[PDB]
Amino acid sequence: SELLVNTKSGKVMGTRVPVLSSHISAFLGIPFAEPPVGNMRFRRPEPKKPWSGVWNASTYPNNCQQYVDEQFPGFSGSEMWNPNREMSEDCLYLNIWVPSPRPKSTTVMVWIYGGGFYSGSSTLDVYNGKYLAYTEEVVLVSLSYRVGAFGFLALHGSQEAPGNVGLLDQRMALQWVHDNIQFFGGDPKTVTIFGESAGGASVGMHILSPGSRDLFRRAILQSGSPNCPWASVSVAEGRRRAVELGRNLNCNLNSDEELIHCLREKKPQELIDVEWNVLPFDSIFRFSFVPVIDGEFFPTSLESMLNSGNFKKTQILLGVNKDEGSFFLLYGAPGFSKDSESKISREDFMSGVKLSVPHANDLGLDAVTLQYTDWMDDNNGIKNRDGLDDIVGDHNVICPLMHFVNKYTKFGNGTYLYFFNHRASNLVWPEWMGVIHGYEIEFVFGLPLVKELNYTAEEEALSRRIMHYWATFAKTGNPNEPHSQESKWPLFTTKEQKFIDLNTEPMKVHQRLRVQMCVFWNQFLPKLLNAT
Amino acid sequence: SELLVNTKSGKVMGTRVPVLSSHISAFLGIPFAEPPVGNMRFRRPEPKKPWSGVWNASTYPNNCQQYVDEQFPGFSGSEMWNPNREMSEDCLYLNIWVPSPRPKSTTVMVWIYGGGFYSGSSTLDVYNGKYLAYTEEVVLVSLSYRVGAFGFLALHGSQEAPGNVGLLDQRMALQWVHDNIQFFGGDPKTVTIFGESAGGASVGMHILSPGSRDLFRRAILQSGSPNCPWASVSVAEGRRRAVELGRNLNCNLNSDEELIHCLREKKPQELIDVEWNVLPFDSIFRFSFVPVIDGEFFPTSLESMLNSGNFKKTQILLGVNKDEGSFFLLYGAPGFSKDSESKISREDFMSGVKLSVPHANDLGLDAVTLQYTDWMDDNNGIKNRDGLDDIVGDHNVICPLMHFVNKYTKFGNGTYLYFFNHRASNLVWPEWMGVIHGYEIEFVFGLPLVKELNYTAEEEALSRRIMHYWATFAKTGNPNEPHSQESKWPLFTTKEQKFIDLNTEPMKVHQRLRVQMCVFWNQFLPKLLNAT
Ligand SMILES: *[C@@H]1O[C@H](CO)[C@@H](O[C@@H]2O[C@H](CO)[C@@H](O)[C@H](O)[C@H]2NC(C)=O)[C@H](O)[C@H]1NC(C)=O
Ligand SMILES: *[C@@H]1O[C@H](CO)[C@@H](O)[C@H](O)[C@H]1NC(C)=O
Ligand SMILES: *[C@@H]1O[C@H](CO)[C@@H](O)[C@H](O)[C@H]1NC(C)=O
Ligand SMILES: *[C@@H]1O[C@H](CO)[C@@H](O)[C@H](O)[C@H]1NC(C)=O
Numbered sequence A, B: 001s002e003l004l005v006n007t008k009s010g011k012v013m014g015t016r017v018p019v020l021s022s023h024i025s026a027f028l029g030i031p032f033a034e035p036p037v038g039n040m041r042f043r044r045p046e047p048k049k050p051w052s053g054v055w056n057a058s059t060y061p062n063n064c065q066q067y068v069d070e071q072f073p074g075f076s077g078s079e080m081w082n083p084n085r086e087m088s089e090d091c092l093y094l095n096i097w098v099p100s101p102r103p104k105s106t107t108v109m110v111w112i113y114g115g116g117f118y119s120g121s122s123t124l125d126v127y128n129g130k131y132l133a134y135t136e137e138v139v140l141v142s143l144s145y146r147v148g149a150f151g152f153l154a155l156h157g158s159q160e161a162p163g164n165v166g167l168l169d170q171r172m173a174l175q176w177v178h179d180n181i182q183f184f185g186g187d188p189k190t191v192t193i194f195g196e197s198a199g200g201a202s203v204g205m206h207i208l209s210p211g212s213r214d215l216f217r218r219a220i221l222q223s224g225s226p227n228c229p230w231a232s233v234s235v236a237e238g239r240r241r242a243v244e245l246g247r248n249l250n251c252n253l254n255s256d257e258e259l260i261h262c263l264r265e266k267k268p269q270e271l272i273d274v275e276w277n278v279l280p281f282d283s284i285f286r287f288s289f290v291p292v293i294d295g296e297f298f299p300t301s302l303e304s305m306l307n308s309g310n311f312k313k314t315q316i317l318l319g320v321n322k323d324e325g326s327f328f329l330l331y332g333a334p335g336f337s338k339d340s341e342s343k344i345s346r347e348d349f350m351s352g353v354k355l356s357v358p359h360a361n362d363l364g365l366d367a368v369t370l371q372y373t374d375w376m377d378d379n380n381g382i383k384n385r386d387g388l389d390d391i392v393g394d395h396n397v398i399c400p401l402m403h404f405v406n407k408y409t410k411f412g413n414g415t416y417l418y419f420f421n422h423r424a425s426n427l428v429w430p431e432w433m434g435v436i437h438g439y440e441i442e443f444v445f446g447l448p449l450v451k452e453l454n455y456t457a458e459e460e461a462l463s464r465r466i467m468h469y470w471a472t473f474a475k476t477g478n479p480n481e482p483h484s485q486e487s488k489w490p491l492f493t494t495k496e497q498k499f500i501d502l503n504t505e506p507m508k509v510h511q512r513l514r515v516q517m518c519v520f521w522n523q524f525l526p527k528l529l530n531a532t
């Protein structure tokens, strides 16, 4: 039977699913770990114990316990990112989409969801792997991992809550793919890990961590990189936030054991209710429980690792969206609203800068303000709004990714860089938000090929081109079809620094993505803040 | 007799001089002070003792002792700025050009020469007052003042070398105009002081100093302002440089008296030979002996004076040239030559920045570099050359002048701002130097009306327009002809900040002259250097 697969962990039964007039197999909600529940809360995951009988893999699994966005109830723009399944601490599952007929040894793509390490779901409509698996003849896996304090509470020195366990969940899922994907007709020697935002940071974290490098072949990073300022904290900061969480829940704070024990008695939602209280600053684009630079998962600082070449050397494909910062300003910056054009006053700009660069002294804040203010026109509400948008996306996504691409490319074996600047014609978010953080995903997953979703012809065409770039990259380490009349996506080189735009127009090659702004963020501002 | 005038100091006999097919009277080399020689070297000037008989004022006076530019022997571009008369410490004289027939009570314009306080001459071909006096029916005076250590050696506390005596020379000449110009047919209640560079700084210094305010009505500043970073030093720095001069000349350094006595024994040229050795840094656009913030001539710091409105409140007309910095890079920056296009390498740019901002720590230098580097094209030799040109002119001339205009306009009674961006068609300096520091002077003095000098028709027209702007400003406090069909030079206001271009095209009004760069130089960089 096509829907029956015998893995090393036991047999699984899938389901035949329709996709664009054909069908493929789906194996949804396969367990890869023991449920991280009870005394296991905050612990390293354990391998799932093999089961007798047949695992029903016909339906999506629970989503991990997480903060739920209620900022716009019934709005599809925000709700499409929320858990669409029951939340449970029992959430360590993966989903596999397999072409029909079952292949023998096909390219494998493993999706890691974003969500700022505090949210995310593998089961989202926009993460449905059927279009990609079917169109490009890949075995498509989506994994899952603990988020929030559940995945990232970090008390370094303690073995009950060491930190990073969400990353270890991801690694356990990659391990299980490596070990079992062959039975689903995937080639475990040609696995691409790909992810957006926290999932992109995650991808680069597996590239860095010695314990993960051997479990995949190549990597794709969308709108995130391991060195993002929001993606990790020191072991002291992680400890400080863990204790603060404890303080919020009236815990005994005398010892790690007393603290962890107390936090283990609480219901998931009690943790979630106070999670945002532990942030050290008034900030946007900062999340409470994130990866911790521990000396185990990451042996030394991310920067010394990137500088020394202490990471997996392979091919990478990565890039960013035009307007990375708009979501975060909509949600926390004064003067931004969903149903207005959000023209930003001088005062609100100033407040925005403070929220955007929370670790900055006044001199630092003045440097940012000057760098992004048109002083011929400093009261232009559109310029202030767009300047803030750029500040947030440059600082949090684009310039760290550009620092990563530049460090990586010196030691790696091939880099492809994109700039995604097409705004979906059917976006429900306002125009001021532009090409929004996360709105390339639907194109990567092939949603524009579904007529009932109302994209344009040109959007379907763009989607098919991106799916084919991603899948050919995963197959060969090169997004370009060898021997093909199509415009070619050039390698990114240390010297020439080329990238392409990804949009509905004919391909254009550019050099030095946002170089002016990224010299500021990666070289000048850090030196300023260190010296003052 | 038209050429005979009885002043309060004695009678003077002038000479009839040809000018553009007509004639006017010139009274050249009238003494306004006792010769500052011998034991008077470095001292406050003394009023000239009245003379019996008739002073022969038919010929130009000696020029003050000064460094002489030999950087390009026989080149007219540089030699036209050098003393064209014998140098002597006996150099405190003024020149008056008087329309014919002698007027009764006409507008007076008094020219103060620039030259970085270390050089300058009232007798230069380009400072010839006949064209302006004749064309615009003004009485035109050029004064003179001690330069170099002779005018500016400063040992605060000492009465033999207090500092600022060059400024006091200027003031004594303004005093003598105030007292005697009526006999030449000038109105001492309508005297405009005007000057370029050090002469412009000088003009603004008289606007600030309580001891000078009452001696003139209004003021014009060309390419210089009192707050320029090169135009004054602290009393400690002046003292330090005075002692260093003494060290260079093997002087007894035990006391001010011993030092001053030693310096008074030396020949002028001995002082001049070591003058450049006292600068604290490797620098361009820094001069050794300059005005000193003494608490007498300037009662408090220039900045508190500008902020409190502690200055003469009247009308001012002022502005700058497009390429203020090129002269100083030609002469001291590595990679610049007179007979090449001076395309500047990355390394030479970096060296240039260091020479240009000598008081800067490394962070400071990085801030400047970033602000003026196109990082898409950082090896563009033209961009590096022009960037350096802008750095030097912005830091030394334009942004300090813009800080002055903005502070002044809050308390003053009317401001007119220009941006002179026409390159003379007959310039002998290379093209890369653009609209050079000091090359609006020939237009202000009306040299383009002299056919034998080979300007264009349009240049003569521009010159006539500028002469008429300057003279109408001096006459009325407004460069515009009331009731006239000509395009109008708008007032500069705190709010709108308007200025005009001065060139051969039809007049264009702009706002916020070099605002982006001047926020950097006037607000951000000073705060950076103070905090680090
Ligand atoms: C320059 O100063 C004069 C006064 O010294 C100003 O003219 C006065 O303006 C106020 C308000 O418009 C009136 O009440 C007076 O009648 C005016 N006085 C005279 C003598 O006209 C003038 O506003 C100032 N100009 C600028 C540009 O500041
Ligand atoms: C698996 O689960 C689905 C939904 O709960 C159910 O319809 C199906 O019959 C189950 N068992 C199988 C396929 O053996
Ligand atoms: C697509 O278009 C239809 C028909 O015009 C519209 O009713 C519907 O809301 C759209 N469907 C979506 C956004 O899923
Ligand atoms: C004044 O000086 C000039 C030049 O030295 C001379 O020709 C003239 O005769 C002198 N005396 C006069 C005008 O009485």
Ligand SMILES: *[C@@H]1O[C@H](CO)[C@@H](O)[C@H](O)[C@H]1NC(C)=O
Pocket (backbone or CB within 6 Å): B452, B453, B454
């Ligand atoms: C002006 O033009 C003439 C004739 O063409 C030329 O010989 C002379 O050098 C120029 N005169 C100057 C620059 O004074």
Ligand SMILES: [Cl-]
Pocket (backbone or CB within 6 Å): A018, A019, A020, A450
């Ligand atoms: Cl479908």
Ligand SMILES: [Cl-]
Pocket (backbone or CB within 6 Å): B018, B019, B020, B450
């Ligand atoms: Cl003539």
